[PDB]
Design a protein around this motif. Structure first.
Motif, mmCIF file in Angstrom:
data_model
loop_
_atom_site.group_PDB
_atom_site.id
_atom_site.type_symbol
_atom_site.label_atom_id
_atom_site.label_comp_id
_atom_site.label_asym_id
_atom_site.label_seq_id
_atom_site.Cartn_x
_atom_site.Cartn_y
_atom_site.Cartn_z
ATOM 1 N N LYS A 188 0.681 -1.297 -0.324
ATOM 2 C CA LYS A 188 -0.220 0.036 0.043
ATOM 3 C C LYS A 188 0.607 0.913 0.059
ATOM 4 C CE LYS A 188 -0.300 -0.342 4.908
ATOM 5 N NZ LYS A 188 -0.896 0.096 5.962
ATOM 6 N N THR A 189 2.260 1.002 -0.167
ATOM 7 C CA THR A 189 2.796 2.721 0.506
ATOM 8 C C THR A 189 2.777 2.844 -1.681
ATOM 9 O OG1 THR A 189 3.377 1.105 2.214
ATOM 10 C CG2 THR A 189 4.687 3.407 0.688
ATOM 11 N N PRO A 190 2.929 3.838 -1.941
ATOM 12 C CA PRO A 190 3.365 4.504 -3.574
ATOM 13 C C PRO A 190 5.219 4.842 -3.580
ATOM 14 C CG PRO A 190 1.651 5.993 -1.900
ATOM 15 C CD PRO A 190 2.456 4.860 -0.979
ATOM 16 N N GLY A 191 5.506 3.920 -4.774
ATOM 17 C CA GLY A 191 6.697 4.431 -5.049
ATOM 18 C C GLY A 191 7.634 3.320 -4.227
ATOM 19 N N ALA A 192 7.394 2.285 -3.445
ATOM 20 C CA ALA A 192 8.114 1.305 -2.890
ATOM 21 C C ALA A 192 8.463 0.804 -4.114
ATOM 22 C CB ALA A 192 6.814 0.212 -2.358
ATOM 23 N N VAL A 193 10.350 0.254 -3.573
ATOM 24 C CA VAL A 193 11.530 0.213 -4.005
ATOM 25 C C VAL A 193 11.471 -1.822 -3.546
ATOM 26 C CG1 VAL A 193 13.218 0.101 -5.135
ATOM 27 C CG2 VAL A 193 12.341 1.857 -3.834
ATOM 28 N N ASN A 194 10.945 -1.932 -1.721
ATOM 29 C CA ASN A 194 11.246 -3.332 -1.324
ATOM 30 C C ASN A 194 13.226 -3.632 -2.226
ATOM 31 O OD1 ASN A 194 11.073 -5.796 -0.347
ATOM 32 N ND2 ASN A 194 9.595 -6.653 -2.247
ATOM 33 N N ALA A 195 14.417 -2.903 -1.790
ATOM 34 C CA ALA A 195 15.411 -3.668 -2.008
ATOM 35 C C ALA A 195 15.531 -4.916 -1.324
ATOM 36 C CB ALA A 195 16.299 -1.979 -1.081
ATOM 37 N N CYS A 196 15.267 -4.841 -0.071
ATOM 38 C CA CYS A 196 15.058 -6.299 0.751
ATOM 39 C C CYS A 196 14.977 -7.241 0.258
ATOM 40 C CB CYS A 196 15.222 -5.948 2.383
ATOM 41 S SG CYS A 196 16.163 -4.294 3.466
ATOM 42 N N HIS A 197 13.464 -6.684 -0.809
ATOM 43 C CA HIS A 197 13.017 -7.977 -1.211
ATOM 44 C C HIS A 197 12.539 -9.052 -0.222
ATOM 45 C CE1 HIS A 197 15.556 -7.086 -4.707
ATOM 46 N NE2 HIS A 197 14.277 -6.555 -5.282
ATOM 47 N N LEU A 198 11.406 -7.605 0.580
ATOM 48 C CA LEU A 198 11.078 -8.538 2.258
ATOM 49 C C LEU A 198 9.740 -8.593 1.875
ATOM 50 C CD1 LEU A 198 13.257 -8.762 4.772
ATOM 51 C CD2 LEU A 198 12.283 -10.734 3.938
ATOM 52 N N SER A 199 8.492 -8.936 2.817
ATOM 53 C CA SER A 199 7.034 -7.661 2.948
ATOM 54 C C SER A 199 7.412 -8.050 5.033
ATOM 55 C CB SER A 199 6.603 -9.528 3.194
ATOM 56 O OG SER A 199 5.153 -8.889 3.804
ATOM 57 N N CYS A 200 6.619 -6.794 4.568
ATOM 58 C CA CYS A 200 6.694 -5.891 5.781
ATOM 59 C C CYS A 200 6.747 -7.072 6.798
ATOM 60 C CB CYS A 200 6.290 -4.561 5.808
ATOM 61 S SG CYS A 200 6.955 -3.236 4.402
ATOM 62 N N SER A 201 5.693 -7.554 6.743
ATOM 63 C CA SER A 201 5.608 -8.490 7.660
ATOM 64 C C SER A 201 6.176 -9.370 8.324
ATOM 65 C CB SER A 201 5.070 -9.766 6.738
ATOM 66 O OG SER A 201 3.921 -10.848 7.613
ATOM 67 N N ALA A 202 7.586 -9.931 7.211
ATOM 68 C CA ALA A 202 8.910 -10.285 7.586
ATOM 69 C C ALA A 202 9.303 -9.493 9.155
ATOM 70 C CB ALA A 202 9.616 -10.333 6.597
ATOM 71 N N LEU A 203 9.252 -8.160 8.971
ATOM 72 C CA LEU A 203 9.731 -6.854 10.375
ATOM 73 C C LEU A 203 9.171 -7.374 11.775
ATOM 74 C CD1 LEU A 203 10.819 -4.622 7.637
ATOM 75 C CD2 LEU A 203 12.105 -6.917 8.455
ATOM 76 N N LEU A 204 7.865 -8.232 11.605
ATOM 77 C CA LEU A 204 6.808 -8.171 12.816
ATOM 78 C C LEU A 204 7.414 -9.199 13.662
ATOM 79 C CD1 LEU A 204 4.502 -5.541 11.112
ATOM 80 C CD2 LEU A 204 6.160 -5.167 12.811
ATOM 81 N N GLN A 205 7.677 -10.491 13.185
ATOM 82 C CA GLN A 205 8.313 -11.334 13.508
ATOM 83 C C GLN A 205 9.124 -11.542 15.231
ATOM 84 O OE1 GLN A 205 8.619 -14.951 10.389
ATOM 85 N NE2 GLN A 205 10.364 -12.799 10.513
ATOM 86 N N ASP A 206 9.394 -12.962 15.917
ATOM 87 C CA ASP A 206 9.937 -12.234 17.414
ATOM 88 C C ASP A 206 11.555 -12.160 16.925
ATOM 89 O OD1 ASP A 206 7.510 -11.540 19.020
ATOM 90 O OD2 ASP A 206 7.020 -13.423 19.862
ATOM 91 N N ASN A 207 11.183 -13.523 15.627
ATOM 92 C CA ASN A 207 12.957 -13.714 15.410
ATOM 93 C C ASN A 207 13.040 -12.383 14.318
ATOM 94 O OD1 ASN A 207 14.715 -14.922 13.111
ATOM 95 N ND2 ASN A 207 14.410 -17.063 14.567
ATOM 96 N N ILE A 208 13.774 -11.583 14.818
ATOM 97 C CA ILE A 208 14.885 -10.637 14.132
ATOM 98 C C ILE A 208 15.497 -11.243 13.059
ATOM 99 C CG2 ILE A 208 14.085 -9.428 15.860
ATOM 100 C CD1 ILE A 208 17.116 -9.559 16.746
#
Length: 130
Positions: free
Chosen positions: A69-89
């Motif tokens: 839902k973010t305009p002009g998103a690049v996704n340089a890490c090639h990850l779903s943002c969901s991956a960044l809310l896990q307990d495992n970092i």
């Protein structure tokens, strides 16, 4: 999950963050603390530009992770943002390494500049056995 200080310090160490691109563990700790309070579930919506910061390092959805839902998103890490809310970092760490690989380095994160740069940050790793 809200990491305890030394628990996070040891976790970051195991993941190869100490001295990564010349950035000490203390500097990474200072960054995580002021970005999220060591909270993996932290998110911050930036109403002005329609982007969101995710996780322990508050990584932004415009350049690093994709949330659809973010305009002009690049996704340089090639990850779903969901991956960044896990307990495992592990994923957050892999992406934070990609971030500092840019010419700006850790200087990119304003939070680091405001509360970590040119300050004594050894207090963040003291007593953690790292």
């Amino acid at each position: 999950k809200v990491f305890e200080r030394c628990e996070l310090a040891r976790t970051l160490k195991r993941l190869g963050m100490d001295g990564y691109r010349g950035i000490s563990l203390a500097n990474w700790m200072c960054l995580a603390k002021w970005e999220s309070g060591y909270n993996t579930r932290a998110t911050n919506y930036n109403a002005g530009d329609r982007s969101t910061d995710y996780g322990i390092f508050q990584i932004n959805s415009r350049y690093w992770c994709n949330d659809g839902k973010t305009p002009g998103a690049v996704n340089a890490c090639h990850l779903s943002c969901s991956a960044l809310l896990q307990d495992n970092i592990a994923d957050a760490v892999a992406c934070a390494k990609r971030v500092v690989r840019d010419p700006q380095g850790i200087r990119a994160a304003v939070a680091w500049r405001n509360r970590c740069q040119n300050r004594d940050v050894r207090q963040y790793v003291q007593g953690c056995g790292v």
